[PDB]
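Summary for the steering committee. The consortium agreed at its last meeting that each partner would contribute one worked example illustrating the joint modelling workflow. Our contribution is presented below. We chose a case with several input lines so that the handling of multiple components could be demonstrated. No manual editing was applied between input and output; the record is shown as generated.
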Amino acid sequence: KVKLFRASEPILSVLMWGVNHTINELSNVPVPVMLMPDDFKAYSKIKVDNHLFNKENLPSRFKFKEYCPMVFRNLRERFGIDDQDYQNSVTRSAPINSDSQGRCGTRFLTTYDRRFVIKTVSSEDVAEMHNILKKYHQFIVECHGNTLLPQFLGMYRLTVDGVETYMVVTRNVFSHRLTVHRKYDLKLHVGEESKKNFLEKLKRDVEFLAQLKIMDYSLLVGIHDVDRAEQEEMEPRFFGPGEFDPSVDVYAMKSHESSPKKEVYFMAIIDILTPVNPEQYSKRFNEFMSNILT
Amino acid sequence: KVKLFRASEPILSVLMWGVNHTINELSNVPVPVMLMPDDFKAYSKIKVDNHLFNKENLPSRFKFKEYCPMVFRNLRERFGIDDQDYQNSVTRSAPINSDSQGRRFLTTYDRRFVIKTVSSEDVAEMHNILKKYHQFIVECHGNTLLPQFLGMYRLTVDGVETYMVVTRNVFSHRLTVHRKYDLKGSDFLQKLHVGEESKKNFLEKLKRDVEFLAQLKIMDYSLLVGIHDVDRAEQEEMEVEERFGPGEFDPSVDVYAMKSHESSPKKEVYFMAIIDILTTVNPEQYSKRFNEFMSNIL
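What follows is the complete predicted structure of the assembly.
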C-alpha cells in the first residue's frame, strides 16, 4: 500500500493527497459526543512546498483547504460512510470524469469505484453551503440520513499554480455499478413501500428546502434498462439482473414486479446551493411528482 | 491508533506531529535503488493553519521542514532502524528531558533517541558533510562511533524557528549511567578493561572513524565515555522496576555499549562514542593523536 497519488491532471493528485491527509489527520482527533457551533465556522488549511522531493506525481507546491472538517466527519457517519472507505475511494486510484448530474457544477467527476461524485463549484457555492450547513446537519440528524437531498461528504479548496478550485464531494445519485442509460431533469412504476417511502422523504425534504428559503432546485431522474444492460455486453461482488445493494445505491428503486420492462430508477433532488415564493415552489414540487409515480 | 500529541510545550507536540507526518508521507514514496545528487539538497516543508479545529494539543499555526528526507530515511535503514519504530519512539508519548545532556537535550520517552536543538550553522555544516557521511555509513555498514544521524528538522511555532538533529542515544535506553567522562582537546586518565572481541572491534572502528573526520578536515571533536556500574545498579536501584539481567544489554539496540572483561575488577558496562562532529594543529595530526590517545584507555 504505497500510495502514489497518480493522475492525468496535477489538480487530481492534489485532491487525492488532501483527502488522504485530512482523513488521517482526523483519525487522531477524537470523535466528540456532540458538534459545537465552532465546528461550523471551522477549517484546516495546509500549504505544501516540497523541493526536489516526491515530485514524480504531485506538484512541488500546493495548498489544500478543508472546510468544517468535524461536521463532514459526522455527516459521513450519518450517511453510513466509513472514513477509511471514503479515503480509499478517493486515493486508491485517480478520480475519472463523469457525465453531469446537475446544472450546479462546472466539472463533474467520479471516484474510480463510482461511489462518490466530485463537483467543482464557485466560491459563492462554498459560502452558500456554509449558510445552510447547521440546519442541514440538523435535518440529516432528524431524518437519519434518509433523504433525496444531496448527501454532502466533503468540501475542499485546492490551489495549484496560483489557481484556486473549490470542490464538493457527495454520494453518487446513480449506481456505482449499474449504468444510467437515460437522465431526466424535472423543474414510472414502483413497489408500494417504495412509493410510500419516496413520497414520505420527498415531502420531508421539500419542506426543509422551503424553510431554508430555497427555490429552483430540480429532481434528477436516472433510469437503468436491464434488458439493454444484458444486450450491451454480449459482443467481484455478485448481483443478478436488476439488482443492487440499497445501503450503497441509496437513491435506487426497482420497477414494480407486475410491470413491463425490468428497470431501476434513481431519483434525487439536485441544485440546492446556487438557485412564486419558496413555500409555493415546495407545495408545487410535492404535487408535481405525486402524479408522476407508479 | 488516535495520536493526540499531548506534550508540555507546543514545540514538542509539533515535533511529534512532524515526524508522524513525514514518516507517513515517506511510506508513500518508494525506497529507491540509489540516492541521487538532488536527494542531498532536497527538502519537505509544510504549513498548517487550523482555525477552530484540532487546537487540543497542537497549535493552530505551525510550520515543519525536514531536510533531505531521502538521505535520512536511508541512513535509518543503514543503522538497522525501521521507520515505524522511529515514528513510534517519537510519537507514542512526548519526548522528555535528558538525564544528562550538554552545556540541554531531549530524549524520546523510551530513551532510544536523542533530539538536540541546534543552530542554523549546524544545519549548514551537516549539509556540507552529508554525502560524504552517507558514503562513509555505507562502507562502514552503520558500524561507527560517530554520531549516527537519523533526521533533521526545523519547526516554527509561535514565531520561532528551532533546528533539531535526532541521533541514536550514545548510552543505553535502559541501563543507568553513573559516571560520564568527556575527553576533549588534549583528560580523566583506573583504565577500562574489555573483552577480546570488544577491544579488537572498537579499535577497528575508531581507526576508520578518525580517518574519516581527518579527510573531511574536521578537528576539535571529543570522545564521550559512559560507565554503568552494575553492582551499584543492583544495590541503589534494586526493585525499581516492579515498584536482560542486572547489567546485560541488547547489542543491536545499544551499539556503543561494551562489557567489562571476564577477568576484571568489578561488573561494568562502557559506552563510548565520538561526539562534536559539526561545529591550530592539523586534522590529520588530531586524527593521529586521537587514535593513539583513546586506544590506551583499553
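The first strand of chain A starts at residue 43 and ends at 49. Helices of chain A lie at 10-26, 38-41, 69-78, 83-91, 123-142, 192-211, 226-231, 278-292.
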